Amino acid sequence: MFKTIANDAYRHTKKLLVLVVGETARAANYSLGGYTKNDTNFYTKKDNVVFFDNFSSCGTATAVSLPCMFSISKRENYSSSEFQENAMDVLYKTGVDAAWFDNNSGGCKGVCDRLAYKQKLSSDLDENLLIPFKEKLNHLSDQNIIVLHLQGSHGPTYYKRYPSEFKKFTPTCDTNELSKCDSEALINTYDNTLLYTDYLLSEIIKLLKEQKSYESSLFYLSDHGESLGENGIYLHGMPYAIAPSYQTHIPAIFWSNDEKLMNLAKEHKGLKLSQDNLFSTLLGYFNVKTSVYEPEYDLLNPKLKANP
Numbered sequence: 326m327f328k329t330i331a332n333d334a335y336r337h338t339k340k341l342l343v344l345v346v347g348e349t350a351r352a353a354n355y356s357l358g359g360y361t362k363n364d365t366n367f368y369t370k371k372d373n374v375v376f377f378d379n380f381s382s383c384g385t386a387t388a389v390s391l392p393c394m395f396s397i398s399k400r401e402n403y404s405s406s407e408f409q410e411n412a413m414d415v416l417y418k419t420g421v422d423a424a425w426f427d428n429n430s431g432g433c434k435g436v437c438d439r440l441a442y443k444q445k446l447s448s449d450l451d452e453n454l455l456i457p458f459k460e461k462l463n464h465l466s467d468q469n470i471i472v473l474h475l476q477g478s479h480g481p482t483y484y485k486r487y488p489s490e491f492k493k494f495t496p497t498c499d500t501n502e503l504s505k506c507d508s509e510a511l512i513n514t515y516d517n518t519l520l521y522t523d524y525l526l527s528e529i530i531k532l533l534k535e536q537k538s539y540e541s542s543l544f545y546l547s548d549h550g551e552s553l554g555e556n557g558i559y560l561h562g563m564p565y566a567i568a569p570s571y572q573t574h575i576p577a578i579f580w581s582n583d584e585k586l587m588n589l590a591k592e593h594k595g596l597k598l599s600q601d602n603l604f605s606t607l608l609g610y611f612n613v614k615t616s617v618y619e620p621e622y623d624l625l626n627p628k629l630k631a632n633p
């Protein structure tokens with residue numbers, strides 16, 4: 326059975342939301358949030374982006390996180406067996422222009438399947454996403470959501486995620502055989518991947534400022550965190566309930582040229598939020614009218630409260 330959701334949904338202003346779904350990035354290594362060893366957020370710091378310092382993920386592996394964050398279900402009631410429409414289907418059926426560009430080696434895990442304009446790239450440098458993004462910026466409609474799904478910090482071959490121009494933190498760990506590396510070198514490599522992702526964000530913002538015929542927003546969040554040898558744990562996917570915050574505590578970053586959203590975002594940044602919030606935030610952004618919309622979960626809505 327393929328269940329439909331928000332069957333009562335419907336929708337003016339010229340709007341553009343760029344949703345960036347990250348990969349393996351963990352909040353603890355964001356300088357936007359007070360990480361001091363390496364300045365990982367050098368680029369988006371210059372755009373005064375809003376950083377959510379208390380943002381959690383739905384799961385500890387892509388297979389749970391990616392579908393769940395886009396699903397109507399929150400972490401406590403999500404099941405992997407559910408097979409139904411997600412936030413993107415609701416925006417599409419409600420007439421919003423939806424594009425999904427995927428550079429992630431794992432795919433969209435079924436989220437993008439029913440979109441008309443979706444693309445899979447080769448999972449090389451994330452910068453390749455800027456190509457179909459620029460091309461979609463020519464054929465915009467009145468309301469658009471563009472999803473960019475990053476390879477981001479995918480491990481264990483971290484050193485392959487960024488070009489030499491962003492090997493800024495050294496020495497590095499240029500192997501998948503992570504336990505052989507000094508831990509500082511491993512961290513440096515991991516931080517470089519964050520830096521590269523940070524740069525790409527500000528390049529997205531940079532293209533967004535050339536589009537002022539529209540109200541433009543960037544929302545970036547990771548699917549989950551990552552362990553880097555602390556307590557002998559590597560990679561991710563540890564069962565959520567026993568997982569270290571390294572795997573569940575993720576970055577979330579918002580930017581808009583509409584600085585009223587920018588200041589609603591700034592007001593919420595310290596609240597206990599999570600991927601649970603993505604569903605209503607995405608409906609709310611394109612003003613989708615429906616009963617499944619929960620105003621107290623929309624990040625860009627004054628009635629937003631923290632998670633229970």
Ligand SMILES: [Zn+2]
Pocket residue numbers: 348349386387388548549
């Ligand atoms: Zn993942």
